[PDB]
Design an enzyme around this catalytic site. Structure first.
Site, mmCIF file in Angstrom:
data_model
loop_
_atom_site.group_PDB
_atom_site.id
_atom_site.type_symbol
_atom_site.label_atom_id
_atom_site.label_comp_id
_atom_site.label_asym_id
_atom_site.label_seq_id
_atom_site.Cartn_x
_atom_site.Cartn_y
_atom_site.Cartn_z
ATOM 1 C CB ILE A 18 9.750 -5.606 20.216
ATOM 2 C CG1 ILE A 18 10.685 -5.515 21.426
ATOM 3 C CG2 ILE A 18 10.508 -5.632 18.885
ATOM 4 C CD1 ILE A 18 11.658 -6.666 21.584
ATOM 5 N N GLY A 19 7.584 -4.202 18.088
ATOM 6 C CA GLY A 19 6.526 -4.518 17.144
ATOM 7 C C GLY A 19 5.128 -3.998 17.475
ATOM 8 C CB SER A 20 3.787 -1.798 20.024
ATOM 9 O OG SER A 20 4.864 -0.919 20.296
ATOM 10 C CE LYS A 22 7.981 0.851 20.808
ATOM 11 N NZ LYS A 22 9.217 0.955 19.946
ATOM 12 C CB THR A 24 4.139 2.667 11.836
ATOM 13 O OG1 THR A 24 4.716 1.641 11.016
ATOM 14 C CG2 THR A 24 2.875 3.177 11.177
ATOM 15 C CD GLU A 41 14.197 1.847 20.859
ATOM 16 O OE1 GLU A 41 14.232 1.214 19.784
ATOM 17 O OE2 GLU A 41 13.755 1.377 21.936
ATOM 18 C CE1 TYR A 59 17.512 -7.827 19.796
ATOM 19 C CE2 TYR A 59 16.875 -9.481 21.442
ATOM 20 C CZ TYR A 59 16.626 -8.286 20.766
ATOM 21 O OH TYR A 59 15.497 -7.562 21.081
ATOM 22 C CD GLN A 70 18.988 -3.184 28.449
ATOM 23 O OE1 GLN A 70 18.441 -3.879 27.627
ATOM 24 N NE2 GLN A 70 18.632 -1.923 28.674
ATOM 25 N NE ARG A 94 10.575 0.186 23.664
ATOM 26 C CZ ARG A 94 10.751 -0.611 22.601
ATOM 27 N NH1 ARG A 94 11.754 -0.400 21.724
ATOM 28 N NH2 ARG A 94 9.920 -1.633 22.401
#
Ligand SMILES: Nc1ccn([C@H]2CC[C@@H](COP(=O)(O)O)O2)c(=O)n1
Ligand SMILES: Nc1ccn([C@H]2CC[C@@H](COP(=O)(O)O)O2)c(=O)n1
Lengths: 192, 197
Positions: A18-20, A22, A24, A41, A59, A70, A94
């Site tokens: 998360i926040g890598s 992707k 972008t 995704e 969450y 999931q 992903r």
């Protein structure tokens, strides 16, 4: 014999925490829409399952909603992995593999998924393996340090996934590393 | 193009309420084991998912375990529906269809499945339909009245479904009826009704 078998072109899977970066990264391929099947995704599906936001509930109350969430992720991933296309190249954000080896395994570890639920998901994964074709020719790992990922997440004026602790990103990072670095071809990129 | 497509012989599905005498019925076919693929409901798989008894947990705490339980049932049913065989005839106790149209629908109705979980199962069902071939050539409905079933349940040895209330068997009965008599549900394949009195 497997569903979708031989119906899919060369496929590239974008993996990362998360926040890598992707989303972008994938924006860069948008000019090539006409020659490249390009599947981000399906967060929008997860937010709107006939009105119910699975992502939020997951969450909010992980012990109740991790299993359903999931399960559904796995479905939407399979739906992408198998969607017909004419294009010569397919790129996915992903995959069913990240769902299985990172996110699900992580929810098992921090105890949000009970062993009973986990096993249900795992028996499905085994059955999916035997009956559905999931084409996967190359994975691009957008590697980063949990710390750098936290930054972005909080920078982004943003929403759901927004409220995650660093320890959680650490745990996910390690799982991606176990899967992608420590043991199809993997191309690692420094996304710092 | 679907998984298992054209790998399956003429298939008969035995449908009926809890306590409609399915287990008894199917014991009659056991001498024919050599010519008939014979698959009883995989209750034993549901009782032992790497140690965990989903069936119990489902009857104990429906709001927490209904979703995982049915998800698992659906999987085991597909496992049966698709298992390879050489035999010229295949016979299953229950099916993915009874799971979707009776048990899951009933858990939605009495509120044990939240809309969100229901929807997840339903999206699966739709995707199963498109990708996994489920052979079904004839259904044998073991029809009974809830009362006769409730009674058959009470006579048997205990665990699990035992304390299903009569109202529940009524609700299940009506759902089977909607599906196999009033035909309110999307099914192809002939239905043969038997009076299980
Ligand atoms: N298997 C997955 C896939 C996604 N997500 C969350 C992480 C961020 C958000 C979108 O990315 O969804 C998750 O928890 N588990
Ligand atoms: N889809 C199914 C199938 C079976 N059962 C329950 C009904 C009684 C018990 C044994 O049959 O399992 C259930 O709840 N849901």
């Amino acid at each position: 014999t497997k569903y979708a078998e031989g119906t899919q072109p060369f496929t590239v899977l974008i993996e990362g925490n998360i926040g890598s970066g992707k989303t972008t990264y994938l924006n860069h391929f948008e000019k090539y829409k006409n020659d490249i099947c390009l599947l981000t995704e399906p967060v929008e599906k997860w937010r709107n399952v006939n009105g119910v936001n699975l992502l939020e509930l997951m969450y909010k109350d992980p012990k109740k909603w991790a299993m359903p969430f999931q399960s559904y992720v796995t479905l939407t991933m399979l739906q992408s992995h198998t969607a017909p296309t004419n294009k010569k190249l397919k790129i996915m954000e992903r995959s069913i593999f990240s769902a299985r080896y990172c996110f699900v395994e992580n929810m098992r570890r921090n105890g949000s998924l009970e062993q009973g639920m986990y096993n249900t998901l795992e028996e499905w994964y085994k059955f999916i393996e035997e009956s559905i074709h999931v084409q996967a020719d190359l994975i691009i790992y957008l590697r980063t340090s949990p710390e750098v990922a936290y930054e972005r997440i909080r920078q982004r004026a943003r929403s759901e996934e927004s409220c995650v602790p660093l320890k959680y990103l650490q745990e996910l990072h390690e799982l991606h590393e176990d899967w992608l670095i420590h043991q199809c071809k993997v191309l690692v990129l420094d996304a710092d």
